Structure formats: structure tokens, C-alpha cells
Write a protein that binds this ligand. Structure first.
Ligand SMILES: [Zn+2]
Ligand SMILES: [Zn+2]
Ligand SMILES: [Zn+2]
Ligand SMILES: [Zn+2]
Lengths: 49, 110, 279, 180, 45
């Protein structure tokens, strides 16, 4: 189901900042990525193994 | 799920926009893209230096992105580059070029 | 490199593993312990739900034209900049082959499957010393006959000869090599019904001929030198078994056959009339 | 085998060594068919040995219809003698048979369908123009035409001997593919 | 092979795989599929 733009606003008016976050990252598509600390570009070649 | 890494986890505090220097592209790029072919010339895996070589990211949930490793759900995809034969306008800036040229001598640059 | 991924339950490990994909959960699970191996499965029908490499390969294409917001001093040059790289590609002779054969099989009133096999049968051979030109017809005249028969629809050489005049000879040599092209890369029944309809007959007259022609074929009577003829005689055999006016002269031109092969072919029939008695 | 490949035509080349006046060659002959509108070669049929030959402005003669190496050879020697009677010093020099085509029979009905189908790679068939199979051998390099009547048309050799060898090789195939 | 039924001729057919999809007695090209034999249970609720 869609968490629309207006649902986002209604959640802001409630002030529920954490739910707004969880509903937007945990509940949809979080993604860890690495970034260079100099050129802040997702260009790190992580061999995290 | 997602495998443990070690880089310290932070949160973004600032975005600095800004254009892209052609040197920067080349320094980033992992591959010189040359041949319009996608697949390998033998109807098999993929043309190296082709329009998606394996050194760019990979998909199929079955391969490893030989640049940075396996997970199709870890690799963010790595950028490759093409160097044009001759330079061209970037559509977003034609107006901001025509405007600019009208503000500087077209001979000395001042 | 080997660039390869395999899943296996690291806490059972017993196998090339026994795992199942629970799609509606986006999971793969060890069918033994139920450890979920990998998740966030990506859809597999919605992908093409929103929507030819066997021919068009890897050199891709895109139809470039004129939008609403362009004047003719930019539109026609898109028609004058697209023309600089049509000879580095032999693909004109690739596509204009298909376009031609598409223009052919379609004008020929043929099933769109044959169109593909001919869009194939060109593309597979597409240049050989055996080909070395040879009028570029005979292939599109045989690769169709290939594409036709290979698609289980058989048509006579004259029938295609009607579509394309191939001198009847450039056809023959081109066919032999072509067939052997695939053999290295590796059925006259079809004529009975198409003929009956050409005469506008009910099914039984055609129904019977399949028995008769097969039975006339099955025992003896090699009979015919291109059995096209000895097909029709079955109709003539069976039409006379019925009493419907398809008089010999009407048969001939309708099916473009010699009359002589009929009666002499019917000689072996006015004598063999013994064993075709089904009812 | 037990079957001799029976030659029906031998085509051979003979260098008479002179630029023959094909007009005078046609004029001084007894029954010779030469007019430039078909070929640049006088064609003569000699009944003994009965051979048909085309002799060009180069003086080179190609002979056909012979039933032997010696039929063609003796016919060509007679041809050179005829040319010399015409007036040109024809000579039998560097003769070579360029073709020996024969027809014989193995006489047992053949599963030609089996051969062609299983030897599609080697033999091709479109039985709606001509009912014969085409087969190839490199050692010896003989091409063989096969028909259900048992007729074997062996071609592709300067000698009847390659005909014989490939026939000794192909008759066993025929008996193997013998329909019954 | 399995039973079939012509759509119009309405004759049991029993063809197999790699037979023509075609009716005897009328070269009609539509066949039904000769309903199952195992019993089937409903509730009169
Ligand atoms: Zn950096
Ligand atoms: Zn990667
Ligand atoms: Zn200046
Ligand atoms: Zn397990």
C-alpha cells in the first residue's frame, strides 16, 4: 500500500519523527552504502569481506 | 541480512552539489566503455568494455560484480565512462552558456 | 573469476541444497531448517508486465523522428544525419532482407511464424561461399520454403515461384546448400487440404484423400516425379468417388497441373480401386 | 562389390601444338560441326572410336563419349591425323583425361531415404525435381549420383581407377543401405 | 491419450500429443475436454 505524500504530511503534523523514518526506510528499502570522506561520492570500492 | 562492515557509520549532514570535472569522471570510472554491444559477441555473458561490462555492477542475483563483490544487493553499481570524440553542450546549461558568453570577451576571456 | 553465486544452508550443508523460493515473501529458505537464505526477492512478471535480439543482435537501434516541438529546419536533418552510417553496416541487407521477406510472406498470406523462420533462415546463413550472392532471391525464396516447411507448412516450388520468379534453377542449387547449412549448424501431406479448399469442397472429399494417398503411397506406386501430381490424383480419385463437377479441365488451371499426369496417374487408380473401401 | 563401374563418357584434353584454322578444319573434315556462334572449337564425331571432341583456337581438344582411356586416346590420335591431313601438324603432346564419368549398377533396391536422411551432412535431397542422391568421397575424390533403379553415376576422376576405388568403397554402403 | 469432445460434431475423440487438434467427422477445430471421472463433493450449504 502506498505511504503517499499526504500521509507524510499528516505524520509530520503529528510530530512522529521516528515512525516517519521507520515507515520510510525499514519498512520500504533501506540500503547501506559507503562514501568517500573527501569526494562525498558513493564511489568507495568496499571489499567488506 | 546485510553483511557487517567496519567503516564507521555516520549520518549525512550536508550535500554539496556542483558539476563534474572530466578528470574526476576518469578518476572515478572503472571502465572505458567502447562497444555499443551489450552481450558478448557470442550471444553469451557480456562484452567486456561493452555497454555493461562486468566491472560495472552486476545483476542476475547470481554473479559477483568483479569490481566490488558479490551481492547484487550489496554492490551499488560502479560508474564507467565514455570520452566523447569532440565536446558538446549539456542541455541543462545552453541557456546558462549563451547567457555567460554574453558576459565575457569571446577572445581574451576577460 | 567465475563470477558465480550459489546458495546453500550453512547449517545443514547436506546437498546441492533443498531450498524453496517463497516468492510472496521474497525469500529463499532451506527446505530443511527453514533458515532463510536470501531475501528481497525481485519480481519476475511485473518486470515485463509493463512491456528482435535473435536477429538484431547487439548493434541496437532506435527509431528517430520529429516531435511536436521541432521545425523542419531541424526535422529533415535528423533525416540528413541518420544517413551517414548505413554502409559500415551490411545490416541494410540484413533488415531490408527481413523487410523484403516480411513484405513477401505477409503479402503471401502466411502465418507469422513462417515469417520468423525466414527471418531466421536468412540470418543464420546470411553469408556463405555457397551464397556468394546468387541473386539474393533464391535464399529469400528458399529460406521461406525452409521457413515454411521448417514451420510445418509445405508449399510447392511453383507456388513460391508465383511469388518470386527464381528461374526455377537458382532455386534448386540454393536450396541444397541451405538445408545443409543447418545440418552442419545442427512431407507432401501438407498439399492435400490446401488443394481441396482451392476447389471449395466439403471436408469428406478431403478427409478421404488422406487415407487414399497414404494408402496409395504405403504399399507401392513410387508414382510421380515430384509427388505434387499424385497428390491431386487422390482428389481426382476421390472426387470421382463422389459425383461433384470438378471436370479435369477445371482441375488443371485451378491447380496449374498437367492433365496428362492425371489420367495416366488415374490409370494406376482405375485399376487399384480395390482397397480404398472404408465404408 | 563384384561390379565394374562402367564408364559412359571420357573427356580428355589433347595439345595438338598448332593454332588450327577452325574454318579449314571444318572445311576439310567429312562430318564436323563447327560454327563460331556456339563455341570456338570444331566439334567432330568419329564413329571409330565414336567420340565427340571440341578443338579450340589454341589447338586444344576435349573429347567426350569415350568408353575407355584407350578409346579417347586412339580417337585423339586419329583426330590429330585428321588435322594433319587438313594441313596442320597436330601432335599428341601432354595429353590428359580431364574427366571419366560412368554408369553401372549394384541392382539391389536401396534405402536412399536412409542414406540421404542420415547423410544429410554429406548428401542432400529434394525429391520433387530429381530422385537421385549426391555423395562425395575425397579418397578417392569421386562424386556419385545414386538412383533407386540401382544406377551409379560415378564422376570426378581423370581415371577410371579412382572410379573403381570409390565404387569399391561405396557399393558396401549401397548394400548396407539396400532396401528389400 | 485422453478423451475430448468436438465442439459441434460432439464426438468423443481420444487423440494424443502430436496429433492434429481437429475433429473427425467435421474438421472442426475446437475440442472440449471430457470431464473428469473421479467424483466431486459439494456441500448443500
Ligand atoms: Zn573520494
Ligand atoms: Zn559491485
Ligand atoms: Zn577580450
Ligand atoms: Zn538448513
Amino acid at each position: 500500500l502506498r505511504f503517499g505524500e499526504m500521509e507524510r504530511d499528516c505524520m509530520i503534523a503529528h510530530g512522529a519523527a521516528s515512525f516517519l523514518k521507520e515507515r520510510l526506510m525499514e519498512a520500504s528499502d533501506a540500503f547501506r552504502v559507503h562514501i568517500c570522506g573527501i569526494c562525498g561520492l558513493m564511489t568507495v570500492i568496499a571489499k567488506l569481506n | 541480512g546485510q553483511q557487517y562492515s567496519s567503516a564507521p557509520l555516520r549520518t549525512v549532514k550536508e550535500v554539496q552539489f556542483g558539476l563534474f570535472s572530466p578528470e574526476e569522471v576518469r578518476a572515478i570510472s572503472v571502465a572505458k566503455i567502447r562497444f555499443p554491444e551489450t552481450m558478448d559477441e557470442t550471444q553469451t555473458r557480456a562484452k567486456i568494455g561493452g555497454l555493461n561490462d562486468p566491472r560495472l555492477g552486476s545483476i542476475d542475483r547470481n554473479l559477483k560484480c568483479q569490481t566490488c563483490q558479490e551481492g547484487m544487493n550489496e554492490c551499488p553499481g560502479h560508474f564507467g565512462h565514455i570520452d566523447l570524440a569532440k565536446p558538446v553542450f549539456h542541455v541543462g546549461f545552453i541557456a546558462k552558456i549563451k547567457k555567460v558568453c554574453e558576459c565575457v570577451c569571446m577572445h581574451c576571456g576577460k | 573469476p567465475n563470477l558465480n553465486i550459489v546458495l546453500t544452508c550453512p547449517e545443514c550443508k547436506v546437498y546441492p541444497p533443498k531450498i524453496v523460493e517463497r516468492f510472496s515473501e521474497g525469500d529463499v529458505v532451506c527446505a530443511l531448517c527453514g533458515l532463510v537464505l536470501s531475501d528481497k526477492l525481485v519480481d519476475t512478471r511485473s518486470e515485463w508486465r509493463t512491456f528482435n535480439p535473435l536477429l538484431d543482435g547487439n548493434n541496437l537501434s532506435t527509431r528517430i523522428g520529429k516531435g511536436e516541438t521541432t521545425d523542419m529546419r531541424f526535422t529533415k536533418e535528423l533525416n540528413k544525419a541518420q544517413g551517414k552510417n548505413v554502409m559500415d553496416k551490411k545490416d541494410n541487407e540484413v533488415q531490408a532482407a527481413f523487410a523484403k521477406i516480411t513484405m513477401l510472406c505477409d503479402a503471401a498470406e502466411l502465418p507469422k511464424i513462417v515469417k520468423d523462420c525466414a527471418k531466421e533462415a536468412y540470418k543464420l546463413c546470411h553469408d556463405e561461399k555457397t551464397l556468394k550472392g546468387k541473386s539474393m532471391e533464391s535464399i529469400m525464396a528458399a529460406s521461406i520454403l525452409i521457413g515454411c516447411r521448417r514451420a510445418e507448412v509445405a508449399r510447392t516450388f511453383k507456388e513460391i515461384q508465383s511469388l518470386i520468379h527464381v528461374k526455377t534453377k537458382e532455386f534448386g542449387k540454393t536450396l541444397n546448400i541451405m538445408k545443409n547449412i543447418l545440418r552442419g549448424k545442427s512431407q507432401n501431406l501438407t498439399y492435400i487440404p490446401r488443394f481441396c479448399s482451392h476447389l471449395g469442397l466439403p471436408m469428406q472429399v478431403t478427409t478421404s484423400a488422406e487415407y487414399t494417398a497414404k494408402k496409395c503411397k504405403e504399399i507401392k506406386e513410387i508414382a510421380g516425379k515430384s509427388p505434387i501430381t499424385i497428390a491431386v490424383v487422390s482428389i481426382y480419385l476421390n472426387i470421382l468417388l463422389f459425383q461433384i463437377p470438378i471436370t479435369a479441365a477445371k482441375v488443371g488451371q485451378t491447380l496449374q497441373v498437367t492433365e496428362g499426369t492425371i489420367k495416366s496417374g488415374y490409370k494406376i487408380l482405375y485399376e487399384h480401386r480395390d482397397k480404398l473401401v472404408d465404408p | 562389390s563384384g561390379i565394374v563401374p562402367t564408364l559412359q563418357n571420357i573427356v580428355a584434353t589433347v595439345t595438338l601444338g598448332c593454332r588450327l584454322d577452325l574454318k579449314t578444319v571444318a572445311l576439310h573434315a567429312r562430318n564436323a560441326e563447327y560454327n563460331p556462334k556456339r563455341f570456338a572449337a570444331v566439334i567432330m564425331r568419329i564413329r571409330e572410336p565414336k567420340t565427340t571432341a571440341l578443338i579450340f583456337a589454341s589447338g586444344k581438344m576435349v573429347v567426350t563419349g569415350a568408353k575407355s582411356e584407350d578409346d579417347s586416346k586412339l580417337a585423339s590420335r586419329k583426330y590429330a591425323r585428321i588435322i594433319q591431313k587438313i594441313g596442320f601438324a597436330a601432335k599428341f603432346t601432354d595429353f590428359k583425361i580431364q574427366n571419366i564419368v560412368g554408369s553401372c549398377d549394384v541392382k539391389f533396391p536401396i534405402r536412399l531415404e536412409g542414406l540421404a536422411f542420415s547423410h544429410g551432412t554429406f548428401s542432400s535431397y529434394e525429391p520433387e525435381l530429381f530422385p537421385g542422391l549426391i555423395y562425395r568421397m575425397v579418397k578417392p575424390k569421386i562424386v556419385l549420383l545414386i538412383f533407386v533403379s540401382g544406377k551409379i553415376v560415378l564422376t570426378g576422376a581423370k581415371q577410371r581407377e579412382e572410379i573403381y576405388q570409390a565404387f569399391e568403397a561405396i557399393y558396401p554402403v549401397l548394400s548396407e543401405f539396400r532396401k528389400m | 491419450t485422453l478423451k475430448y469432445i468436438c465442439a459441434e460434431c460432439s464426438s468423443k475423440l481420444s487423440l494424443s500429443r502430436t496429433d492434429a487438434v481437429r475433429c473427425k467427422d467435421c474438421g472442426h477445430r475446437i475440442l472440449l475436454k471430457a470431464r473428469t471421472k473421479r467424483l466431486v463433493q459439494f456441500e448443500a450449504r
